[PDB]
Design an enzyme around this catalytic site. Structure first.
Site, PDB file in Angstrom:
ATOM      1  CG  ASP A 162      -1.710   1.970   8.447  1.00 29.41           C
ATOM      2  OD1 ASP A 162      -2.116   1.489   7.363  1.00 29.41           O
ATOM      3  OD2 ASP A 162      -2.399   3.002   9.132  1.00 29.41           O
TER       4      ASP A 162
ATOM      5  NE  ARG B 146      -6.804  11.270   4.102  1.00 25.82           N
ATOM      6  CZ  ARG B 146      -6.809  10.020   4.453  1.00 25.82           C
ATOM      7  NH1 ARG B 146      -7.879   9.919   5.831  1.00 25.82           N
ATOM      8  NH2 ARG B 146      -6.510   8.926   4.122  1.00 25.82           N
TER       9      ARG B 146
ATOM     10  NE  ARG C  23      -3.886   0.769   1.513  1.00 23.34           N
ATOM     11  CZ  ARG C  23      -4.103   1.716   2.215  1.00 23.34           C
ATOM     12  NH1 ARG C  23      -3.616   2.318   3.108  1.00 23.34           N
ATOM     13  NH2 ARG C  23      -4.535   2.936   1.238  1.00 23.34           N
TER      14      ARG C  23
ATOM     15  CD  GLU D 110      -2.955  10.395   3.565  1.00 21.76           C
ATOM     16  OE1 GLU D 110      -4.046  10.685   3.333  1.00 21.76           O
ATOM     17  OE2 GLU D 110      -2.471   9.621   3.665  1.00 21.76           O
TER      18      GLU D 110
ATOM     19  CE1 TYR E  18      -4.828   6.507   1.428  1.00 21.18           C
ATOM     20  CE2 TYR E  18      -2.524   7.040   1.396  1.00 21.18           C
ATOM     21  CZ  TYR E  18      -3.743   7.028   1.800  1.00 21.18           C
ATOM     22  OH  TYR E  18      -4.061   7.300   3.178  1.00 21.18           O
TER      23      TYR E  18
END
Ligand code: NA
EC number: 3.2.1.18
Length: 601
Positions: free
Chosen positions: A46, A230, A22, A214, A324
């Site tokens: 993550d 975002r 990712r 982000e 993304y």
């Protein structure tokens, strides 16, 4: 030339060593090599999980890719270490390539504890890998201390994709990589991290906004640096701010309504990076993101031709699942797109011929009319370069039993064109809120917009609050007045906790702004919370404003996110009141995003 768009997968979940890949990052090295980086999540999670930063390399412009190499390896055995969310920045002047990323130990973004000590396993550190050989070998540094000017920056991470190097003005040469911090007050902000000495030292500039995440920055045709964020506060859009300096600060953050976003990452680049300041080529932007506001799907590439003020061009590259996405200008004239199709990370290449075209942003005003009427509204088109188009068309998009037609006079180089749209709506047309798509068809490309045609509803700009039982206005903006602004994202909220206020017989009244013949009311639940949802209600009208009569209607509305109707036999009234008797799940508050009154203007 001929329209190009090809794609191939670089990482496929399960194959080549990781159950999860990712967070895409694309760059083109000083010598024409495409470099693609991404997380290899042995855990599928993550930070602070044992993630690794990987890299695939293409030396033939992106057709073939090399083996998957590790840039920063995470340790799965205790003590657990992880690297995540890569972002490339290429110093075009010296040749240095920087791959920024998160360095985790025990805490991730939401768990990071104050501190800059590389050793403290409780802070999310900010790392940078530097390479002087085009990406072959790297040098790691932890720069958390260089970039945390305020002991309150409790947490941070670099926004993945790719950073920039200024070209224009007195700071030409500066590298910029965007971050998201968690300040002292628990708030998320955007901060630019930059180096004026080719990355030997990195200092952080001035933070911006609240509810950021982000974010991405771009250099405008004039040196201004636009920031596209975002929205962690989920408004289904991108927030934008602009800066005019070098000690970095942006003006106020506002929401861009042309940028529907499901609160996800997005990419925004200069389409012609080496164009000179002020020129038309320096004004061209490309933006990729997921056009859906409720889902991570409908990947669409948009084009701007005036530094991001208008976004007339658009095309879907992935109608299906798309999360993304990151863009890069290829040395051959095309653009490289590396994204998340849900299967891992995929690589795509397209050219401008494949996008559609014509930098001709146009506008058509919002129309309000009564069912069974015909209205003609003017179109204003603003034209670009090689644009003498004698025969442009106007294809409107509406409901089947709606007659919509439009015309535009010819487009002349750098001139404004005129036209008009004739809408005819049937008499059995249910009240208001209609989106109409317009598409400017031309033999030099497409340009599209949307306006609104509202049928049989009163004007909110003439409405005001007559009374309300309680308004939460301390902890948040739960203003009675947010129901009449045309925005589902804003809501009236009853005085909630942080003050133990009244219970359920709640209510709100609107001053219609004069006597009208009304026959209904529509209400939209609060969109992003389910415990202040109205269930049982009763409607009352009045014209003196003191003596209320009803109920003129009663019912229990549903859990529907769309507007819900409270219909009643037409009558005159100057004010309307909604009494909420109960909440859907028995909880104690009422919140309303919007109230619409059906009637005659
Ligand atoms: Na609202």
């Amino acid at each position: 030339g001929e329209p190009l768009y090809t794609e191939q997968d670089l990482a496929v979940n399960g194959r080549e060593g990781f159950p999860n890949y990712r967070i895409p990052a694309l760059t083109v090295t000083p010598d024409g090599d495409l470099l693609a980086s991404y997380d290899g999540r042995p855990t599928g999670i993550d930070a602070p999980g044992p993630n690794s930063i990987l890299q695939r390399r293409s030396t033939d412009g992106g057709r073939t890719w090399g083996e998957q190499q590790v840039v920063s390896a995470g340790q799965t055995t205790a003590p657990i270490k992880g690297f995540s969310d890569p972002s490339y920045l290429v110093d075009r002047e010296t040749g240095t390539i920087f791959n920024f990323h998160v360095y985790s130990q025990r805490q991730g973004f939401a768990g990071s504890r104050p501190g800059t000590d590389p050793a403290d396993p409780n802070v999310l550190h900010a790392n940078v890998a530097t390479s002087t050989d085009g990406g072959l070998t790297w040098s790691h540094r932890t720069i958390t201390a260089d970039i945390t000017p305020d002991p309150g920056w409790r947490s941070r991470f670099a926004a993945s994709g790719e950073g920039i190097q200024l070209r224009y003005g007195p700071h030409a040469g500066r590298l910029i990589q965007q971050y998201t911090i968690i300040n002292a007050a628990g708030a998320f902000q955007a901060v630019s991290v930059y180096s004026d000495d080719h990355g030997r030292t990195w200092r952080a500039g001035e933070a911006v906004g609240v509810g950021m995440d982000e974010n991405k920055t771009v250099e405008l045709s004039d040196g201004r640096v636009l920031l596209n964020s975002r929205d962690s506060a989920r408004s289904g859009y991108r927030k934008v701010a602009v800066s005019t300096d070098g000690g970095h600060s942006y003006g106020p953050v506002t929401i861009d309504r042309d940028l529907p976003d499901p609160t996800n990452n997005a990419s925004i680049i200069r389409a012609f990076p080496d164009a000179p300041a002020g020129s038309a080529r320096a004004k061209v932007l490309l933006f990729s993101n997921a056009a859906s506001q409720t889902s991570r799907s409908q990947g669409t590439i948009r084009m701007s031709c005036d530094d991001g003020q208008t976004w007339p061009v658009s095309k879907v590259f992935q109608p299906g699942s798309m999360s993304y996405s990151t863009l890069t200008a290829l040395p051959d004239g095309t653009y490289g797109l590396l994204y998340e199709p849900g299967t891992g990370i995929r690589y795509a290449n397209f050219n401008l011929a494949w996008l559609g075209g014509i930098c001709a942003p146009f506008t058509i005003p919002d129309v309000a009319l009564e069912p069974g009427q015909q209205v003609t509204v003017p179109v204003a088109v603003t034209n670009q370069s090689g644009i003498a188009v004698p025969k442009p068309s106007l294809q409107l998009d509406a409901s089947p039993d709606w007659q919509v037609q439009g015309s535009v006079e010819p487009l002349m180089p750098g001139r404004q064109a005129k036209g008009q749209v004739t809408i005819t709506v049937p008499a059995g047309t249910t009240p208001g809120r209609y989106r109409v798509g317009a598409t400017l068809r031309t033999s030099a490309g497409n340009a599209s917009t949307t306006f609104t045609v509202t049928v049989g509803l009163l004007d909110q700009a003439r409405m005001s609050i007559a009374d309300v039982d309680s308004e939460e206005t301390a902890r948040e903006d739960g203003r009675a007045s947010n129901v009449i602004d045309g925005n589902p994202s804003t809501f009236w909220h009853t005085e909630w906790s942080r003050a133990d206020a009244p219970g359920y017989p709640h209510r709100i009244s609107l001053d219609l702004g004069g006597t009208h013949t009304i026959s209904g009311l529509q209400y939209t639940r609060r969109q992003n919370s389910a415990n202040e949802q109205v269930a049982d209600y009763e409607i009352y009208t009045s014209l003196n404003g003191t003596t209320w009569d009803g109920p003129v209607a009663s019912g229990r509305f549903t859990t529907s996110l769309a507007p819900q109707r409270a219909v009643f036999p037409a009558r005159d009234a100057r004010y309307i009141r909604l009494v909420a008797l109960s909440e859907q799940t028995g909880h104690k508050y009422a919140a309303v995003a919007e109230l619409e009154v059906e009637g005659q203007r």
